[PDB]
Amino acid sequence: EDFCAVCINGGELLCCDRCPKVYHLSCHVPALLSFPGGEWVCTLCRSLTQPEMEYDCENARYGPGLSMYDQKKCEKLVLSLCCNSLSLPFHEPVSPLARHYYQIIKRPMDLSIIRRKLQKKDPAHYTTPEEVVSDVRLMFWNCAKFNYPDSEVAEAGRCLEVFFEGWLKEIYP
Ligand SMILES: [Zn+2]
Numbered sequence: 001e002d003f004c005a006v007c008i009n010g011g012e013l014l015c016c017d018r019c020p021k022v023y024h025l026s027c028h029v030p031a032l033l034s035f036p037g038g039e040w041v042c043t044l045c046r047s048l049t050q051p052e053m054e055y056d057c058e059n060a061r062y063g064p065g066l067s068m069y070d071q072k073k074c075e076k077l078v079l080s081l082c083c084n085s086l087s088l089p090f091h092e093p094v095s096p097l098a099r100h101y102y103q104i105i106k107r108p109m110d111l112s113i114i115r116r117k118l119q120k121k122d123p124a125h126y127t128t129p130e131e132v133v134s135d136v137r138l139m140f141w142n143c144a145k146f147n148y149p150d151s152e153v154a155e156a157g158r159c160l161e162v163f164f165e166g167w168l169k170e171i172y173p
Pocket residue numbers: 004005006007008009023024027
């Protein structure tokens with residue numbers, strides 16, 4: 001591809017060595033703070049057991065938090081969501097000008113918040129994978145609560161939440 005696997009825009013893109021996906025440094029999960037000089041494998045391709053390489057990311061410079069194992073598994077789940085063609089409406093928060101969204105939705109959630117909370121520096125960083133899964137489910141519950149049932153965004157949410165459940169059972173059997 002010539003466009004970022006996450007945001008579908010061009011520019012300065014990093015290619016994975018093992019799959020066709022390319023990424024902006026800030027769109028990969030975790031975000032990268034430099035362009036790698038040699039081998040580089042994306043979070044979806046990286047091995048859980050034998051990490052080919054550590055990433056130049058914020059959590060690597062920072063060091064009750066995710067174990068290294070759970071960190072990789074949760075980054076895989078979140079990057080899988082961000083790369084899915086149905087996920088784009090969930091990358092950013094709904095405008096407060098849309099139908100009193102923030103009256104209806106008392107606990108808003110989107111993928112940019114989930115990305116941020118995977119970073120240990122965040123005051124509200126995840127300490128368990130259950131918290132990550134809870135935020136993803138909250139996000140899709142909010143989508144179903146707010147959006148018109150017949151709308152394209154509601155249908156996308158219904159499909160993507162079920163794709164996620166499938167990935168979850170692969171990654172946390
Ligand atoms: Zn991007």
